[PDB]
Amino acid sequence: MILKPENEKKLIIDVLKKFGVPEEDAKITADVFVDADLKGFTSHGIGRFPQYITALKLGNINPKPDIKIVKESPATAVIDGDLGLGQVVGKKAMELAIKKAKNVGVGVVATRNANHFGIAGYYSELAMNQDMIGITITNTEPAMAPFGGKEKILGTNPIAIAFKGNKYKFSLDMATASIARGKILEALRKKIKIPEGCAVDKDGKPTTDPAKALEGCILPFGGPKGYGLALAIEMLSAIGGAEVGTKVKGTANPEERCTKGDLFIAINPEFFMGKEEFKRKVDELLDEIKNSEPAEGFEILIPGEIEERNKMKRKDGFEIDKNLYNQLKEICNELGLNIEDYIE
């Protein structure tokens, strides 16, 4: 059934307020949920909300955190999240990264002790919309093997990079994993194969069967190269004192304290070639790319284009499945709220 985004925002706010989350913290959280559902990253949108409820009750999410800047300098900071909503910590960190970059040209803000923050692209787009370059990375509970290995050690480790000109936007937002676990589960319901070169089974051997893949490992994307970048990311994400490797828990499991890290970077074009000079060049490059000769059955896209298109289509509502609408009804009921104020 169709769920209007504004109504998704009000649903999340009213529910989070019910657990003590201050209104401004709640509004912030919702925005990042709505962004994901609008872009089609549906697995980091509302459908993930019940998991948040589970964690709030088990007290793995602190509704009223003491967010602290434990280390600071003109160009860097470390932030302790106090087990608060990743969105709230995340926005603070990146907002502070942006502030520092405006003063001295670049800002690097690492976080520890926060929860999963949703889609990385939201944060680096905060930078883009200040006329800057935003870069965001984080790690994850183990999901992927080293290249040539069969054990789950690395996270799905996303990186997001955003910036824009006068006409074009650039918004790379990607997991270093070659496939989401959700898309494997999904493929297991719909009794089909997963793409080739996306997972290996219990044995280190390649596999297209979803059931095997689920007890095996997902592969980093671009062979040894993509593995290398996921390793780099596992590490850089954690420089504020988070865990790495197998000690990273609690990113998708509400029964565990969250131990992952996030890095937020903001580079400020005014300190280099100049803001207006940069925007002209981004435009010129992306325009060149966009107008180059297509291969056979393709239309050349800029990173981010697909997500923007999704948002347009989805601005007036998007579908959600019954089983989730049910989980919502229930949560709403517990907190003395009417599911019908939001989904109608």
| Residues annotated catalytic, as ranges | 116
Task: Candidates 81-89, 106-114, 311-319, 322-330: pick the segment binding its own copies (CB under 8 A).
Answer: 106-114
| Shortest distance, position 265 Cβ to its own copies, whole Å | 8
Side chain identity at residue 258, one-letter code:
C
Window 280-319: contact mask with its own copies (x via CB under 8 A) = -xx-xx--xx--xxxxx-xxxxxx----------------
120 binds, among ligand NAD, its own copies, none (CB under 5 to 8 A by kind): ligand NAD
Residues engaged in binding ligand NAD (CB under 6 A): 41, 44, 116-121, 138, 140, 147-148, 156, 158, 160, 172-175, 180, 224-225, 228, 251, 301, 303-304, 306-307
Query: Backbone phi, then psi, for 78, in 5-degree steps?
Result: -125, 140
Is residue 133 a contact residue for its own copies (CB under 8 A)?
A: yes
Tell me the two tokens of residue 271: 């300190």
| Shortest distance, position 323 Cβ to its own copies, whole Å | 30
324 CB contacts (<8 Å, ≥6 apart)?
46, 47, 50
| Shortest distance, position 133 Cβ to its own copies, whole Å | 7
61/227 Cα distance (integer angstroms): 31
Side chain identity at residue 188, one-letter code:
L
174/53 Cα distance (integer angstroms): 26
Q: How many residues does the chain have?
A: 344
Measured between alpha carbons, how far is residue 127 from residues 101, 139, 259, 287, 337 in Å? 10, 20, 25, 22, 36
Is residue 174 a contact residue for its own copies (CB under 8 A)?
A: yes
| Shortest distance, position 85 Cβ to its own copies, whole Å | 22
Window 77-96: contact mask with its own copies (x via CB under 8 A) = -x------------------
207/296 Cα distance (integer angstroms): 29
The nearer residue to its own copies, 147 or 325, going by C-beta atoms, is: 147
Measured between alpha carbons, how far is residue 5 from residues 18, 33, 46, 281, 344 in Å? 20, 9, 10, 35, 12
156 binds, among ligand NAD, its own copies, none (CB under 5 to 8 A by kind): ligand NAD
Question: Do 16 and 331 touch, CB atoms closer than 8 A?
Answer: no
